[PDB]
Structure 1
Amino acid sequence: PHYILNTRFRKPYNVESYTPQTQGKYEFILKEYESYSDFERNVTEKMAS
């Protein structure tokens, strides 16, 4: 008799162990990059007579 949760199971003769070994990972990343630029250049020239 083998159990996982409350379910019961039969093990094939070929298999040494089937067991839950119940492990979990979560890996998360979030990334942001931002870049901004603004350039303004002007000229003014005048004459009168």
Structure 2
Amino acid sequence: GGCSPHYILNTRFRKPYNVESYTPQTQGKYEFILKEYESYSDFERNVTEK
């Protein structure tokens, strides 16, 4: 049996006997992490004997 009116947007659904609820609890979580690292090190010498 069943045949209670269940809608999502304009689309109407027939729920299974087994299912208590199927309901559009919409949600969204985005997550962005960017980590850039640089190191440089320079070493020189110049040395002369005459």
Count of residue pairs the alignment pairs up: 46
Give structure 2 stretches of 5+ with no counterpart: none
Deviation sequence 1:23-46 (CA, Å, 0-9, x none): 111111111011111110121011
4+ long deviations beyond 6 Å:
none
Q: Report the aligned-residue RMSD.
A: 0.8
- Structure number with greater CO (CA < 8 Å, separation at least 6) is 2
Structure 2 distance, partners of 1:18, 1:24, is: 18
Percent of pairs identical after alignment? Answer: 100
